[PDB]
């Protein structure tokens with residue numbers, strides 16, 4: 112019985128030196144992400160809506176144009192909702208599908224349903240159009256490096272549908288796509304032909320991005336079994352800062368602070384966490400002041416903060432993957 116699912120417990124990053132850190136800082140472009148990945152997503156896109164379809168096509172199109180060998184799968188299913196049966200579609204983008212282990216980055220691409228109000232439309236800019244655009248920018252920025260993957264370890268991106276409650280949050284009305292996908296992955300043998308390991312055993316770490324884009328976020332270290340990876344993010348932020356590679360940033364106002372959080376935040380990682388998958392939940396505490404209001408829009412986003420976080424996340428991913 113191979114002990115491969117235990118490898119994630121000992122996996123160590125391959126730390127980039129200064130020269131490589133500057134290369135990564137210069138290789139990502141917040142303005143290109145803004146125009147080409149973010150703005151097309153700033154539309155109403157609740158499950159089943161025409162915007163949901165447009166959002167999904169945009170995400171797939173942006174991934175399909177890259178050189179790395181991404182394999183796209185749309186996981187479509189039915190679920191009961193306060194409005195009756197409905198269809199949802201998770202988007203999964205994977206490099207090396209048969210690779211035994213994957214580092215997984217995720218976010219939700221649906222937007223919370225709200226009837227139009229005084230002509231305002233909810234577009235959930237930080238929740239989670241920006242996280243989505245950040246995953247797309249990361250795939251674009253590291254494309255040349257990711258091409259080299261074409262440690263049996265690779266990368267996967269999941270864009271969940273139906274994270275939001277149709278009404279207010281309840282156990283049965285929220286996390287439609289993640290509850291579905293976690294159960295599906297838990298019952299899918301992996302790698303192909305395996306006797307007793309599933310796709311969940313292959314998830315080295317689930318990095319879930321949510322509510323990102325507002326000024327001064329503070330991300331707490333939620334779980335002891337991913338704490339050493341939260342520390343890597345702190346170290347990366349500190350060195351990019353010291354190298355003068357971040358913008359309008361100070362260590363007193365650093366994003367990754369040394370502090371736990373006992374409570375439970377309901378989000379897409381829950382169904383995975385509860386089946387034993389290690390999770391790094393990149394959600395700030397407190398939430399953006401515009402959370403679930405019509406003001407969660409483009410105008411209230413903090414560009415240099417998103418830019419800094421794109422740099423930190425891209426360095427984290429390269430180091431994790433030894434690229």
Ligand SMILES: [Zn+2]
Pocket residue numbers: 223238275403
């Ligand atoms: Zn939300």
